[PDB]
C-alpha cells in the first residue's frame, strides 16, 4: 500500500511517520472507495478487456502468434493470454493499493530474466499492456481512466 511505502521510508529514516506522509495516508483513506469502485469495474469487465487487448496485441505484432513465434499454437496463445491476465489482476491489486508496491514485488522484479529464459518477447508483452490501457480507458470513466492509466503506465515502463 501507499502506507506500506511510507512505512518503509520511515523505517529507513528511523523516525515516526512524517506529517505529510500521514497526510497522503489520509488521502489514500479518502480515495479507498473510489479506487475500489474502479477496481470492481475492471474485474467485472475482465474477460472482454483482455480479449480485446489480446486481439490488438496480436494485430500489432503478428509474429508473436505466427508460426515460429513464441505463442504459435492455441495452447501457447492461451498461455500468453494468461500472462496478460496475471498482469491485469496485478494492476487491479495495485489500483486498490494506491501504490506501485503490489505490482513491483509481482511481475516487475526479474520479469525480464524470466521472459528471456522462456523466450517470450518482452517488447511485445509491453505492447499488450498498452493495449490493455487503451481498453481500460474505453471501459472506465475519464478520471478513472487517468488513475488506472497511471498504474498501467508504471507496469508498461517496468517491462521496458
Amino acid at each position: 500500500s501507499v502506507v506500506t511505502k511510507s512505512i518503509v521510508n520511515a523505517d529507513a529514516e528511523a523516525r515516526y511517520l512524517s506529517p505529510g506522509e500521514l497526510d497522503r495516508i489520509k488521502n489514500f483513506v479518502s480515495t479507498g472507495e473510489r479506487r475500489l469502485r474502479i477496481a470492481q469495474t475492471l474485474t467485472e469487465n475482465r474477460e472482454r478487456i483482455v480479449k480485446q487487448a489480446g486481439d490488438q496485441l496480436f494485430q500489432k505484432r503478428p509474429d508473436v502468434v505466427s508460426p515460429g513465434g513464441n505463442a504459435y499454437g492455441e495452447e501457447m496463445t492461451a498461455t500468453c493470454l494468461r500472462d496478460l491476465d496475471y498482469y491485469l489482476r496485478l494492476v487491479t491489486y495495485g489500483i486498490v493499493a494506491g501504490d506501485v508496491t503490489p505490482i513491483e514485488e509481482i511481475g516487475l522484479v526479474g520479469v525480464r530474466e524470466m521472459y528471456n529464459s522462456l523466450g517470450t518477447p518482452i517488447p511485445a508483452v509491453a505492447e499488450g499492456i498498452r493495449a490493455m490501457k487503451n481498453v481500460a480507458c474505453s471501459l472506465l470513466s475519464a478520471e478513472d481512466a487517468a488513475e488506472a492509466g497511471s498504474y498501467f503506465d508504471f507496469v508498461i515502463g517496468a517491462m521496458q
Binding site: 518503509v8 521510508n9 529507513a12 529514516e13 528511523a14 523516525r15 514485488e105 509481482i106
Partner: protein, 181 residues
Amino acid sequence: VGVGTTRRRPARIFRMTVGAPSAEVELVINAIYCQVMDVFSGQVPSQFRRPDLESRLRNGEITVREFVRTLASSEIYRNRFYTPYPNTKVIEFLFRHLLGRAPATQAEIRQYNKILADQGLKTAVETMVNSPEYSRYFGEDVVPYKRFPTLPAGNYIGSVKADADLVKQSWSSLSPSLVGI
C-alpha cells in the same frame, strides 16, 4: 497452502549514498554510524561518534570509504567490539559490520586471524576496507549496507543466522545481578 509473496522478499534494505551538500548528508552520516557501529535503534548515535570525521565528510575531503576505515580503526569500535568479544568473533563482526555479510568460509577467517594475531586490528579493518568486495558490493562513496550473498556457499543461511544473532554480552563494569523486581 500457498506461499505468499513474502517468502524471503523483504531482507533487502535502503542504500545510502553521498551527494551534494544538504541536511541529508547527516542522514548519510547517521547511516554510516548506524551500520559500521551497531546502534540498535538507528535513531541514537551516542556520544562516542567522531565529529571530526563527520566534518571531513561534509566538506568532501573524506570519502565514505575512508570514513568507514577511520570509524573502524578508532577506539570507539575497538571498545564496543574488539576488546570484549574474542578475536575469532571479531573477524565475523568485521565481516558483518563492514562488508555487510557473514564470513563466507573458514579460509576468510584464517587470513584475517593471522592479521589480527600479528598485524593488529587496525590492519585488519584496513584490509577489509581496501578489499575488492567492498569496492563493488558496498561500493565507493556508498554507505555500506547489510547484504545477503547468494552465490557464496551457504552464505544466505549464514548471513541470515548471523544477522539474526543480535549483539550479546557488553562492555562490562559493575556487572548486573540475576534477579530484579
